[PDB]
Design a protein around this ligand. Structure first.
Ligand code: CLA
Ligand code: CLA
Ligand code: CLA
Ligand code: CLA
Ligand code: CLA
Ligand code: CLA
Ligand code: CLA
Ligand code: CLA
Ligand SMILES: CC1=C(/C=C/C(C)=C/C=C/C(C)=C\C=C\C=C(C)\C=C\C=C(C)\C=C\C2=C(C)CCCC2(C)C)C(C)(C)CCC1
Ligand SMILES: CC1=C(/C=C/C(C)=C/C=C\C(C)=C/C=C/C=C(C)/C=C/C=C(C)/C=C/C2=C(C)CCCC2(C)C)C(C)(C)CCC1
Ligand SMILES: CC1=C(C/C=C(\C)CCC[C@H](C)CCC[C@@H](C)CCCC(C)C)C(=O)c2ccccc2C1=O
Lengths: 42, 62, 728, 165, 154, 48, 166
């Protein structure tokens, strides 16, 4: 590892992969504060 | 002096055009209208690109 | 090794020092395909069963689900015991944002989304029983994918593999028959007799739950099956020399079906699967191979001639041997109806126990199992093209039977073109009349049953005869070959009905002549564009644009949609209009005029009325009473579990919709556009360099095709569904 | 690193208004004792006076504020500024803004200005960490304690979010 | 309390059509309620719901006739935020993707030769290329309105 | 979505706050909102 | 158009570039790996082994209550916040030493050699005294619980079948 760097990418499933293994979290949060309905500030 | 520099394109003919730099080569062969040989790295609906040019054009900066 | 990309792949100019977006669907839209690969078989034969691979490893990857997601959460047990009332379920879903109600809670101690398409009925068919069991077959088949997907790496990779003994074609065409059907048919009989037969015969009353004779038994020692249908089971099988008659007992042509719950007899399925079993074992030796017994490969075909039809059907191809494309129509039209055959067959005369009465799969299934079929054939001979414009080499033909057509084009196609008016144009142009003749047209006199009648009638036909067929004439079998046909010799079971004499008439030589039509002007589209395709009498020289190839001239005053690729681009639409018709006719017969219920005083009572007969003559009758008379199911149907079919055809209507935008639209119009915006990025320096051009013509006769053609399906499966179940 | 001597003062300005900012509620800070979310005002007062609300202490003392702050602004812009503490230099010896008006368009460089000790500067930012302690509690836990040998690092209680407010 | 639309607490509809809507999923006595999955159609869930009943309450939205949330901010009373107190973030949450979006690109002419130099992403992101996203506007958002735009760059 | 998945309770129907102003000043006196003019005694609805 | 041809390694086909694989790991700082893999569970080389002992605590086990401070949910889950922030700043900037600074893109000497390189028996000193320990946290690997919800490895235990029967 480096350096910003750059670093190294990979191919066609990265913009995609982003949807899943991270973006999900959403549904955790949306669970965590069940629904939203509207603004919970802290 | 400017052989193939960051030079412009300027006539109601083109595709790319304002898009700047590049006169690559220039001939010395008089007839035609096509002395100004341009090649960038951006393209029209061909792929080879580069088509030729000249005359009521290069109205540009450095 | 090797490999990997990166730019450039197979469309020669792929890398192109890019320049534009729209390569990412030239590649996604070449990639598998050939010639824009090579017919150089020593690297294309060694792709097709490479394959052909995964598809299975995927099919495995499949089936290994449909038992884990059976046997990890049954309705199987929590029902099986009790068919009838309390029915299917294979998925229950996590408690996110209001998923829940999507897993119903209506299945015998089970929360979960209800399930259409046998399976319960497929696995109460053999026997298995116990979740920890075909869960003991979920693992049987998942690595069991593995090794079959461990064949990619087997050959090809460390093993560039063989066209020499791929090309030939005799061992395999003999062995499939014998070989790997024949490991089957009958080696499902050993299963269908010992495993299957009685863990059903003794299911057929008592044997409620848990003590369930784990198949473990009934090998080495008999006595029990012996205590059941006898056969005298010493160590000497008669029919070694003709005591056949005895080891029978439990397999004389029983036909009809198990009135103690429909299906139809397993006492009626070894005789079916050891005869049609072995023809395919024997008849799967008729060709050359090594040991001097066999036939022509092709040497048979040029065997015979005929004067006109000359040479005959002679010297039958040599790429037919070689590779795919040439071949590739036939294994599809065939396989084609070989999914319309099994269809018009399954419902038509029930396999595995618990169908006839069922619904939500004496329909459901019925369809899909007709999409795949329609789909398959109605896109099978886009392989006749390619081929000519492709895999076909220099020569092999002239005087071939082949050419005898390509000459006789223009005046073969043509004389269909007219049927395809008459047959239809005017035979559909025929509900129309009886609308103009029910609205305008006063029952006084017009085309329905007590109308353009047609008194007795329409017969019967035959069928009926199908009902004197077993009482003599084909001596026996039992009960009328399939209750659906016959006279009034009538059954069912499970309160509701099963199959009965489904009588036809007007409403029957109507409709029909539409499938009777359609599958005319749905072929020839097809044939017109299958014959001309390479030589078209009006751009005469095609192999000069490719397979797809958009159109051509704004000249000759309007040359477009010339390609078969685009003869196929609407080759489909209609199928959908034709498969996505026909299904329909079906689901308002089964029902309204076949399904039942029971009460009693002589009186079966259908899901809907004996309506139909004279309120599906007139075109309309199918929105009066086929929509807003239905849909109610789905129209209301929220806050529930119909709560998906109130949620699909929504975003299925849009996405029938968001077709036309790409399909009615222009193409230059759009490119012309994706500047404008461009100014925003660029001037404000962002902008690509994969110059974001706007989707390639064909490519968008490659979406309003898919999209239309995703659209009005789900929709009707968002729909037809939820009808069935509660008024189901 | 980051960027060029763009704002210094802006944040400096900020840090100036800062310490005595955190000196402000630093009365609630409790010499020993007198705090809470505030209402009053230094000591005293008792003229006629500094009042509410048809008056407000606001607009009176803070219209006129404007020319007291615009002078600096236009002072920055067209330098403009003391001789020269804040823009910028005379004594002694802070953290240098360092540059002069332009670049190669911008970069003939850009930042070789570190070096030294603990020094002058620091406390300017100290009060914004103070703040991001001092704001956070005061509506979450609206009093400020410190308490050894008793029950520091032990606690006592609990108190979270949704109670209600 | 404005336009209608009452704050929920007079309950009239909402609260009841509620203690109706949710509460015939509850009549799911129609199964057997003890421990389940297979069933729990009854007992729980309502915890999120009914054991969040008089809970939701609770800030009003002045849920209205029909008896349901007519959700409004427009810049009056407490509300100036029922979508704005959660209304800014979005602005914020988006266009600093624009920064990554920009500086990702505005790198895709630096180190020189570009595009698919867009497909292989040079794992473009995790800090300042994003982790400037944090701090853009009113401190430096006028990364806009000087030397980067114009535009002024080459 | 919700309206399907038993959940109308929660729902994003954000009720128009703007047209709203009009249609009252231009006369209309139908419930809530203590402002002028259509007051049924108000100083755009007065002088006239 | 390099090279490519060459491009590579510069051709192909068909072999030994070699650098080579692929098909496993790994070229650049496959040493960040190294330098991470020792420490990470050399750390662990001291959590469970203390544990794998305590069962045997000869005469008295341990004892310690507090003597600190005692009230309303008092002490230790607070917590890692302080404890593993401290050892937080420990991890980080010892081992930005795969090289390391920016090779990727006061004084000088010390020590004398090249990471006082080596010595050429002490290279061997680090050896599989470093590695065999991560052979033995493969014992860890294989649970690292032995409490397999296992009852079980009590009454302590751990082991110990040998294997009795009857
Ligand atoms: C379609 C085929 C199918 C298959 C795969 C099998 C397979 C088998 N049968 Mg079998 N069987 C079948 C159909 C089948 N059967 C049918 C239709 C009948 C009724 C005639 C029987 C009646 C039958 C009996 C009575 C017995 C078997 C037995 C057997 C087993 C041992 C035979 C042996 O040891 O070789 C010996 C070879 C000889 C030529 C004798 C073997 C598992 C035997 C068994 O259970 O224990 C050994 C037992 O003898 N079968
Ligand atoms: C035997 C069966 C089956 C198999 C194995 C194939 C295999 C193939 N077909 Mg094919 N096809 C089939 C049934 C099958 N087809 C049927 C039923 C139809 C009628 C609908 C077609 C209509 C069809 C067309 C029009 C074409 C192919 C093409 C191809 C080739 C490339 C497809 C591809 O992946 O491009 C990549 C494209 C995609 C991944 C986009 C498809 C959309 C995805 C997202 C789904 C490949 C040899 C192409 C070809 O032969 O090249 C000239 C093309 O012309 N097929
Ligand atoms: C009377 C009734 C009516 C109103 C019609 C009307 C029609 N028939 Mg027709 N037909 C009828 C009875 C009738 N037929 C009967 C009883 C038979 C034999 C059982 C036919 C066999 C027939 C054939 C073969 C054809 C027509 C065709 C046609 C169409 C003529 C061409 C045209 O108009 O375009 C026209 C719609 C023709 C058609 O569809 O295209 C030319 C077609 O040639 N009919
Ligand atoms: C609702 C219908 C509308 C109508 C009234 C028709 C009517 C017709 N189409 Mg048609 N068609 C339609 C929508 C329609 N189409 C759409 C949306 C498509 C694209 C899916 C097509 C694609 C299509 C094809 C490919 C062909 C027809 C043909 C025909 C004619 C067959 C003879 C006939 O029945 O004449 C009574 C009026 C008929 C004129 C065929 C034809 O004329 O054969 C040469 C055939 O070429 N159609
Ligand atoms: C106001 C209207 C509206 C509009 C614009 C549409 C439009 C559509 N509906 Mg639809 N629908 C509506 C109201 C509407 N519907 C209502 C009120 C109901 C009942 C509540 C339905 C119930 C319904 C069903 C069940 C289906 C559609 C389908 C369709 C699509 C037909 C797609 C096709 O190519 O096959 C049309 C080709 C035919 C041959 C139809 C034959 C119909 C008669 C002559 C028999 C089309 C988007 C369907 C679909 O996408 O697949 C077929 C089907 O799923 N609709
Ligand atoms: C949910 C959440 C999500 C996932 C989104 C997502 C989006 N919003 Mg959005 N929004 C939200 C909540 C959300 N919003 C809220 C609570 C509000 C307050 C009413 C808005 C007010 C809003 C407006 C005014 C706009 C969007 C737009 C957009 C789109 C931005 C397209 C773009 O270039 O920006 C992502 C990347 C950038 C670089 C910026 C994107 C789909 C915009 C749009 O449609 O095109 C720009 C614009 O219309 N939103
Ligand atoms: C940018 C525009 C987009 C467009 C074309 C419209 C257009 C419209 N809106 Mg609207 N609106 C928008 C965004 C938009 N809105 C956004 C983002 C919100 C955030 C809460 C609203 C909140 C809103 C309300 C409460 C109402 C309207 C109404 C209307 C309509 C009458 C004039 C008006 O009140 O709008 C004013 C629009 C703006 C001030 C958008 C400002 C431009 C920003 C987004 C940049 C008109 C059709 C009213 C109506 O006609 O009811 C029948 C009224 O009900 N809008
Ligand atoms: C009946 C008659 C006549 C009279 C007396 C008025 C009177 C009024 N109109 Mg009005 N109007 C009329 C005809 C009339 N209009 C017609 C025919 C039209 C259609 C063209 C309008 C369209 C109209 C609009 C759109 C508005 C008014 C407004 C107003 C009010 C001004 C509000 C204000 O801020 O105070 C200021 C009072 C002054 C006298 C102006 C200050 C000048 C001083 C310093 C001299 C005022 C009461 C405004 C309103 O209702 O409230 C904001 C609103 O702008 N009118
Ligand atoms: C903006 C946004 C968004 C949105 C979205 C939406 C709103 C959508 C919708 C859309 C619509 C509006 C519609 C659509 C729908 C869908 C569908 C429709 C699908 C499909 C399918 C499938 C896959 C199927 C298949 C099948 C078969 C197998 C056969 C039979 C039939 C069926 C269908 C079942 C998102 C989230 C993205 C992200 C963020 C933002
Ligand atoms: C003051 C006022 C107002 C306003 C109004 C209006 C409406 C006006 C017009 C105005 C103008 C004169 C305007 C213009 C504007 C401009 C613009 C321009 C906007 C924007 C933007 C954009 C488009 C952005 C972009 C970006 C940025 C900048 C950041 C982030 C990222 C990006 C890069 C994407 C109000 C409401 C309060 C009322 C009263 C008065
Ligand atoms: C809209 C349209 C286009 C333009 C459509 C295009 C270029 C398709 C867009 C491709 C995808 C959707 C790129 C958009 C961005 C996405 C990759 C993902 C970003 C969005 C979120 C999911 C994050 C055509 O080219 C066309 C051609 C011929 C007839 C009709 C039409 C037509 O109608």
């Amino acid at each position: 590892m480096r350096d910003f760097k750059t670093y190294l990418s990979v191919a066609p499933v990265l913009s995609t992969l982003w949807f899943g293994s991270l973006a999900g979290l959403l549904i955790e949060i949306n669970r965590f504060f069940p629904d939203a309905l509207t603004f919970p500030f802290f | 002096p400017k052989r193939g520099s960051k030079v412009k394109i300027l006539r109601r003919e083109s595709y790319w055009f304002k898009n700047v730099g590049s006169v690559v080569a220039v001939d010395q062969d008089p007839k035609t209208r096509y002395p100004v040989v341009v090649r960038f790295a951006k393209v029209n609906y061909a792929n080879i690109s580069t088509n030729n040019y000249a005359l009521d054009e290069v109205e540009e900066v450095a | 090794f090797e490999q990997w990309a990166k730019p450039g792949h197979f469309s020669r100019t792929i890398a192109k020092g890019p320049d534009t977006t729209t390569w990412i669907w030239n590649l996604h839209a070449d990639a598998h395909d050939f010639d824009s690969h090579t017919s150089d078989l020593e690297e294309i034969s060694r792709k097709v069963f490479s394959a052909h691979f995964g598809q299975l490893s995927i099919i495995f990857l499949w089936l290994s689900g449909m038992y884990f997601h059976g046997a990890r959460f049954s309705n199987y047990e929590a029902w099986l015991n009790d068919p009838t009332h309390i029915g299917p379920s294979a998925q229950v879903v996590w408690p996110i944002v209001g998923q829940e109600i999507l897993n119903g809670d209506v299945g015998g101690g089970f929360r979960g989304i209800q399930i259409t398409s046998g399976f319960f009925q497929i696995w109460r068919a053999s026997g298995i029983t116990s979740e920890l069991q075909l869960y003991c077959t979920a693992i049987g088949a998942l690595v069991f994918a593995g090794l079959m997907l461990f064949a990619g790496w087997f050959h090809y990779h460390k093993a560039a593999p063989k066209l020499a003994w791929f090309q030939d074609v005799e061992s395999m065409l003999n062995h499939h028959l014998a070989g790997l059907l024949g490991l089957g048919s009958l080696s499902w009989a050993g299963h269908q007799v010992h495993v299957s037969l009685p863990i059903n015969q003794f299911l057929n009353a008592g044997v409620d739950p848990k003590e369930i004779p784990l198949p473990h038994e009934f090998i080495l020692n008999r006595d029990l099956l012996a205590q059941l249908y006898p056969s005298f089971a010493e160590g000497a099988t008669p029919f070694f020399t003709l005591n056949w008659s005895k080891y029978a007992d439990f397999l004389t042509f029983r036909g009809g079906l198990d009135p103690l719950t429909g299906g139809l007899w397993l006492t009626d399925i070894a005789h079916h699967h050891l005869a049609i079993a072995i023809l395919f074992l024997i008849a799967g030796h008729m060709y050359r191979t090594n040991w001097g017994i066999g036939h022509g490969i092709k040497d048979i075909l040029e065997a015979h001639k005929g004067p006109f039809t000359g040479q005959g059907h002679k010297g039958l191809y040599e790429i037919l041997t070689t590779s795919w494309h040439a071949q590739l129509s036939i294994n599809l039209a065939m396989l084609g109806s070989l999914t319309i055959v099994v269809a018009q067959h399954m419902y038509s005369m029930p396999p595995y126990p618990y169908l006839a009465t069922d619904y939500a799969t004496q329909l459901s299934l019925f369809t899909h199992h007709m999409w795949i079929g329609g789909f398959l054939i109605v896109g099978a001979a886009a392989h006749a093209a390619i081929f000519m414009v492709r895999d076909y080499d220099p020569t092999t033909r002239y005087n071939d039977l082949l050419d005898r057509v390509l000459r006789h084009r223009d005046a073969i196609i043509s004389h269909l073109n007219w049927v395809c008016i008459f047959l239809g144009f005017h035979s559909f142009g025929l509900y129309i009349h009886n609308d103009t003749m029910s609205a305008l047209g006063r029952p006084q006199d017009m085309f329905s049953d007590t109308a353009i009648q047609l008194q007795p009638v329409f017969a019967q036909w035959i069928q009926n005869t199908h009902a004197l067929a077993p009482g003599t004439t084909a001596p026996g079998a039992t009960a009328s070959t399939s209750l659906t046909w016959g006279g009034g010799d009538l059954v069912a079971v499970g309160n509701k009905v099963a199959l009965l004499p489904i009588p036809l008439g007007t409403a029957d030589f109507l409709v029909h002549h539409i499938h009777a039509f359609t599958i005319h002007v749905t072929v020839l589209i097809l044939l017109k564009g299958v014959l001309f395709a390479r030589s078209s009498r009006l751009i005469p020289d095609k192999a000069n644009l490719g397979f797809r190839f958009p159109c051509d001239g704004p000249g000759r005053g309007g040359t477009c949609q010339v390609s078969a690729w685009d003869h196929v681009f609407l080759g489909l639409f209609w199928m959908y209009n034709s498969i996505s018709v026909v299904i329909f006719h079906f689901s308002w017969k089964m029902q309204s005029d076949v399904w039942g219920t029971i009460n009693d005083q002589g009186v079966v009572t259908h899901i809907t009325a004996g309506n139909f007969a004279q309120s599906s003559i007139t075109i309309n009758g199918w929105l009066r009473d086929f929509l807003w008379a239905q849909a109610s199911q789905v129209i209301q149907s929220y806050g529930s579990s119909l709560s998906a079919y109130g949620l699909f055809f929504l975003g299925a209507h849009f996405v029938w919709a968001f077709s036309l935008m790409f399909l009615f639209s222009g193409r230059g119009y759009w490119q012309e556009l994706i500047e404008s915006i461009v100014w925003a990025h660029n001037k404000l320096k962002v902008a690509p360099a994969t110059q974001p051009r706007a989707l390639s013509i064909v490519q968008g006769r490659a979406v309003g095709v898919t999209h239309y053609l995703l659209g009005g399906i789900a929709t009707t499966w968002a729909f037809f569904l939820a009808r069935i179940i509660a008024v189901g | 690193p980051e960027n060029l001597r763009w704002f210094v003062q802006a944040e400096l300005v900020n840090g100036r208004w800062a310490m005595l900012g955190v000196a402000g509620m630093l009365l609630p800070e409790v010499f020993t004792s007198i705090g809470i979310i505030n209402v009053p005002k230094w000591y005293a007062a008792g003229k006629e006076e500094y009042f509410a609300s048809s008056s407000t202490l606001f607009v009176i003392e803070f219209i006129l504020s404007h020319y007291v702050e615009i002078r600096r602004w236009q002072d920055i812009k067209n330098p403009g500024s003391v001789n020269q503490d804040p823009i910028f230099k005379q004594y002694s010896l802070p953290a240098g803004e360092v540059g002069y008006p332009g670049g190669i368009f911008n970069p003939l460089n850009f930042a070789p200005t570190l070096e030294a000790k603990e020094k002058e500067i620091a406390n300017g930012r100290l009060a914004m960490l103070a703040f991001l302690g001092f704001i956070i509690q005061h509506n979450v836990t609206g009093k400020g304690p410190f308490d050894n040998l008793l029950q520091h690092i032990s606690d006592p209680w609990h108190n979270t979010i949704v109670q209600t407010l | 309390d404005i336009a209608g639309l009452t704050p929920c607490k007079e309950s009239k509809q909402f609260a009841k059509r509620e203690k109706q809507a949710l509460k015939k999923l509850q009549a799911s006595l129609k199964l057997y309620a003890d421990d389940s999955a297979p069933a729990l159609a009854i007992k729980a869930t309502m915890e999120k719901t009914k054991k969040r009943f008089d809970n939701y309450g609770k800030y009003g939205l002045l849920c209205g006739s029909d008896g349901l949330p007519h959700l409004i901010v427009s810049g009056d009373q407490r509300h100036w935020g029922e979508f704005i107190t959660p209304g800014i973030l979005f602005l914020y949450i988006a266009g600093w993707i624009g920064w990554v979006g920009r500086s990702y690109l505005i790198a895709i002419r630096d180190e020189k030769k570009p595009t698919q130099k867009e497909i292989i992403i040079d794992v473009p992101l995790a800090s300042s290329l994003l982790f400037r996203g944090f701090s853009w506007p009113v401190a430096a958002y006028r990364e806009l309105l000087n030397g980067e735009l114009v535009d002024n760059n080459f | 979505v919700m309206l399907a998945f038993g959940t109308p309770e929660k729902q994003i129907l954000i009720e128009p706050i703007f047209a709203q102003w009009i249609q009252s000043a231009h006369g209309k006196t139908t419930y809530g909102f203590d402002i002028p003019l259509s007051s049924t005694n108000g100083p755009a609805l007065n002088a006239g | 158009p390099e090279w490519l041809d060459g491009s590579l390694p510069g051709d192909f086909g068909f072999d030994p570039l070699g650098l080579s694989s692929d098909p496993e790991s790994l070229r650049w700082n496959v040493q960040a790996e190294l330098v991470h893999s020792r420490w990470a569970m050399l750390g662990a080389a001291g959590i469970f082994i203390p544990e794998f002992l305590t069962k045997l605590g000869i005469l008295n086990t341990p004892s310690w209550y507090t003597a600190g401070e005692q009230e309303y949910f008092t002490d230790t889950t607070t917590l890692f916040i302080v404890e593993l922030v401290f050892i937080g700043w420990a991890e980080g900037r010892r081992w930005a030493d795969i090289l390391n600074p920016g090779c990727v893109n006061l004084w000088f000497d010390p020590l004398g050699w090249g990471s006082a390189s080596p010595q050429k028996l002490k290279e061997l000193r680090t050896k599989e005294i470093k590695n065999g320990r991560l052979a033995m946290l493969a014992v860890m690997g294989a649970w690292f619980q032995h409490i397999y919800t296992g009852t079980g490895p009590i009454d302590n235990l751990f082991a110990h079948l040998a294997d009795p029967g009857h």
